[PDB]
């Protein structure tokens, strides 16, 4: 039982709009869809600075600082969002398959390795370092390759830092200094990632143009690298994390659903085949996966929402609420209201088949409006890579002892780390 389900006790006992402790900062939690509406679909609703000093510095040391996530102010977001934006055109994306494929295989094959039906392996951990794997390489043009176990201080270094955030934003000597430590490895790895980018430039090497291009692009005049060191904190964490978390709780659910799973299976074999490589076109006949990745989603959306700033007391749902008042939207609540889903427990990706109307503004786990995620169909794309491969090679069994509820760090994961032993698919 995490915090977002005790605002889910309180949206469904009294009502609408409801005053809440978040953060240790108040908050009024807003759960009717025309409220949703109404200050996502605007740009005269934005972020709540208040809400995000928690990302922007962490224990006295600068983190996401004023990166892409938490600039909260219009025009200074604006600026950077055009510019970030070119990074992840259609064909931008399509160059990257290469790379979700690579780290796919990858991630496979070492699965397949220890797919004897005894050897237990942290699916969570697994997929945490295919996703950052795929993450430096497309973003920063840089390897990883913690799938093969390197970077390991790196890896410390991102546990730290996530913890670092949690235990800031819910009231030890050693592990104060560890996230302070953690925290200042990390820009420093940028620097470093970005020091290599400017000297390869200057030798004239032709750099295929990736997110880093475009965040060196966005800090033109800039007196020092501190705003590009934020973003590139912002799209090591953003870029990786919740897709990874997203990616557990997938596997952990469908551990329980052996119906889906054939039709997963089935579905696999149709379009891709026992075929390799995925190209672009295959991943948008992948229909009934898109349908469980979407209801994954509903049910366990590792970002639970966001906040808006309400500038001035407003009427909201019959309720008045006073100004400079930070409003919190929460997907996780609406995805658990039987109001707006039926027997909202009963994971069901056939809420999302072929002609079923779509939500209405009660399901948003990328958000919803200008400040959504850039990253929403870059995440879709590796994601269903990730998947379609495991699909094709193997079956998982969780581990007898193994839970299904959820913690919050930064995003909402798994309690447990999903403990799975692996078989190839057929045996
Ligand atoms: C399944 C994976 C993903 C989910 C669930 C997810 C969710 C979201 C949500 C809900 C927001 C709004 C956060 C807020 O209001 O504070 C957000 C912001 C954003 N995410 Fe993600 N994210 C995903 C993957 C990605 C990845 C792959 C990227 C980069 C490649 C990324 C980059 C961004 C960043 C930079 C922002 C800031 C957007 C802005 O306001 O300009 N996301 N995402
Ligand atoms: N892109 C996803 C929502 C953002 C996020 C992940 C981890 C920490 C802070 C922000």
Redesign the pocket.
């Given at each position: 039982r995490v915090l977002q389900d005790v605002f889910l006790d309180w949206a469904k006992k009294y009502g609408p709009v409801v005053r809440v402790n978040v953060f240790h900062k108040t908050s009024v939690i807003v759960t009717s869809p025309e409220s949703v509406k109404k200050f996502l679909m605007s740009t005269k609703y934005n972020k709540d600075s208040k809400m995000y000093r928690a990302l922007q510095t962490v224990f006295g040391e600068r983190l996401f600082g004023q990166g892409?996530?938490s600039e909260c102010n219009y025009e200074r977001?604006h600026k950077q969002?055009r510019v970030i934006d070119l990074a992840f055109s259609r064909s931008s994306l399509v160059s990257l398959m290469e790379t979700f494929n690579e780290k796919a295989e990858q991630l496979v094959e070492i699965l397949e390795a220890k797919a004897d039906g005894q050897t237990p392996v942290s699916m969570q951990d697994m997929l945490t370092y295919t996703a950052m794997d795929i993450?430096a390489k497309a973003?920063f043009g840089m390897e990883t390759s913690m799938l093969l176990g390197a970077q390991k201080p790196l890896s410390q270094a991102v546990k730290l830092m996530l913890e670092g955030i949690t235990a800031s934003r819910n009231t030890k000597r050693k592990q104060l200094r560890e996230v302070r430590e953690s925290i200042r490895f990390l820009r420093q790895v940028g620097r470093d990632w970005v020091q290599r980018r400017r000297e390869a430039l200057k030798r004239g090497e032709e750099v295929p143009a990736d997110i880093l291009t475009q965040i060196l692009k966005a800090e033109e005049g800039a007196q020092d690298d501190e705003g590009l060191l934020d973003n590139f904190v912002?799209?090591f964490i953003?870029?990786h994390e919740?897709?990874a978390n997203?990616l557990a709780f997938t596997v952990m659910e469908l551990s329980r659903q052996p119906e889906i799973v054939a039709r997963l299976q089935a579905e696999v074999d149709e379009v891709i085949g026992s075929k390799r490589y995925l190209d672009f076109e295959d991943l948008g006949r992948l229909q009934y996966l898109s349908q469980v990745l979407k209801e994954s989603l509903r049910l366990y959306?590792?970002?639970w929402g966001?906040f808006r700033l309400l500038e001035e007391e407003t009427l909201i749902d019959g309720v008045r609420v006073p100004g400079n008042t930070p409003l919190l939207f929460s997907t996780y609540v609406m995805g658990r209201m039987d109001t707006y889903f039926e027997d909202p427990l009963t994971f069901n990706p056939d809420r999302f088949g072929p002609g079923a109307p779509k939500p209405r503004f009660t399901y948003f786990?990328?958000?919803l409006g200008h400040?959504s995620?850039?990253?929403q169909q870059?995440?879709q794309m590796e994601?269903k890579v990730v998947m379609a491969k495991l699909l094709q090679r193997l079956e998982f069994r969780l581990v007898p002892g193994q839970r299904f509820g959820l913690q919050e760090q930064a995003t909402l994961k798994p309690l447990d780390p999903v403990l799975c032993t692996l078989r190839p698919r057929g045996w």
């Open positions: 892409l996530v977001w969002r993450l973003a912002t799209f953003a870029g919740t897709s997203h959306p590792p970002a966001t786990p990328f958000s400040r995620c850039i990253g870059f995440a994601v």
